[PDB]
Amino acid sequence: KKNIKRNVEKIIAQWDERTRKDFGELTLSTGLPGIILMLAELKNKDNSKIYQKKIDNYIEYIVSKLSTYGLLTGSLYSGAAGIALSILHLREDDEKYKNLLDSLNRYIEYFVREKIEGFNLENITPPDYDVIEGLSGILSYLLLINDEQYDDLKILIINFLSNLTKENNGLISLYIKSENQMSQSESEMYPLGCLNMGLAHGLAGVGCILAYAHIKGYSNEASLSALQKIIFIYEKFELERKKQFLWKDGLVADELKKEKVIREASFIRDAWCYGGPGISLLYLYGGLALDNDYFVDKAEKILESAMQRKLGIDSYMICHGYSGLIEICSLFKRLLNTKKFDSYMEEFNVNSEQILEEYGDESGTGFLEGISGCILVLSKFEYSINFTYWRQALLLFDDFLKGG
């Protein structure tokens, strides 16, 4: 397939122009860190010395912007952890990469410690704890660093997350008040608030990160109890019968008090960020971390249901499109050696040319929603050695069974 090369070239031209002349451009979500990851994964390819030059260009461009403006966030998708993830594989190549990563890490530790200190549980909102902007996503990156100086930070985050699974409002903690929803659509969708049940912004994501922390060597009775409780909550509120393997995006106070779903959702979708595909990671990781065969076997059934169904899928993007579903299947196959998703993976790769050509320009070039995320997926099918840690950003943990 010669069409990856053409597309990459145009992406490079877009970013060469942009750097020759805003906040978004330093983010994993939409900016240079996602671009650096896509190009870095193309190292086997013929133009890889040109690609490494661009990477270094974009890196120097990044430090220059950091030196002038600073960062306001340590977050995986908008802050220092996403920038650090994007260059982590270069750590031992040159002193300049290691120097940059050390700065990022110290800022991250400062950032997290400062966040936990000024935390007010009454104002708890998803970016506090979540994958995209919060501590779960930051921990995903942190757990790739083997330096024991970060042990204290890791444990501080782990304890802080676990404690959010405790009952508060009499009963509550992770519950989000209507006022503290991330946008007004959600404020109006949830006028009495909700417990967010998505991977990206909710309970599954905390669960995954706690399971991953345990296999990495970082857990205590309380974090394991947080993980168990999270899975128990998924098991309790799972939809039934014709809606087996489905979950609403959010659970409201009364439903939680009743311990059943009361009001049906208007819109559930099959996505990484919300719904079955992302939720299947919780069961997979929980099942492997807790040595529960039932959870692992359920994880497969949940994902398989979503692959069959593809509820709400209208694009090939990572976040809530088909490339994200595919990459999750590829992770299942890698860890379990399951053949269940082989046909979907094969069909996606057969359709690869049409996927890139019809890929919207409206989604931009970035990782999370843009074309470069799709290229990353397609590229690791063609050459499965990962030169980078890009998968960490999606909580796809290739090392989950490598131990600690």
Sites of contact with Zn ion (CB under 5 A):
273, 319-320
Least gap, CB of 377 to Zn ion (angstroms): 15
User: CA 305, 308, 309 angle in degrees (round to 5)?
Assistant: 85
Place of tokens 């974090």: 223
Which lies closer to Zn ion via its Cβ, residue 287 or residue 370? 370
Which lies closer to Zn ion via its Cβ, residue 55 or residue 273? 273
Which lies closer to Zn ion via its Cβ, residue 172 or residue 368? 368
Least gap, CB of 245 to Zn ion (angstroms): 19
Which lies closer to Zn ion via its Cβ, residue 101 or residue 132? 132
**249, 197 Cβ separation under 8 angstroms:** yes
Which lies closer to Zn ion via its Cβ, residue 109 or residue 133? 133
Least gap, CB of 95 to Zn ion (angstroms): 38
* Strand partners of residue 196: 250
Count of C-beta atoms within a 10 Å radius of residue 299:
24
Q: After which residues is the chain broken (C to N over 2.5 A)?
A: 21
Report the SS3 class of residue 42. coil
* Strand partners of residue 194: 176
Least gap, CB of 202 to Zn ion (angstroms): 12
Which lies closer to Zn ion via its Cβ, residue 28 or residue 100? 28
Least gap, CB of 307 to Zn ion (angstroms): 17
**280, 336 Cβ separation under 8 angstroms:** no
Rounded CA separation 279/287 (Å): 12
Which lies closer to Zn ion via its Cβ, residue 275 or residue 287? 275
- Tell me the residue length of the chain: 404
Rounded CA separation 299/381 (Å): 22
Structure tokens at 181: 């929803």
Rounded CA separation 179/211 (Å): 30
**61, 55 Cβ separation under 8 angstroms:** no
Rounded CA separation 268/246 (Å): 8
Least gap, CB of 269 to Zn ion (angstroms): 9
Least gap, CB of 327 to Zn ion (angstroms): 13
Least gap, CB of 272 to Zn ion (angstroms): 7
Between 48-69 and 3-20, two packed helices, what is the crossing angle to 10 degrees?
Answer: 30
User: CA 286, 207, 222 angle in degrees (round to 5)?
Assistant: 90
What Cα–Cα distance (Å) separates residue 233 from each residue in 89, 228, 250, 299, 376?
A: 37, 9, 12, 15, 33
Least gap, CB of 128 to Zn ion (angstroms): 19
Which lies closer to Zn ion via its Cβ, residue 323 or residue 392? 323
Which lies closer to Zn ion via its Cβ, residue 207 or residue 321? 321
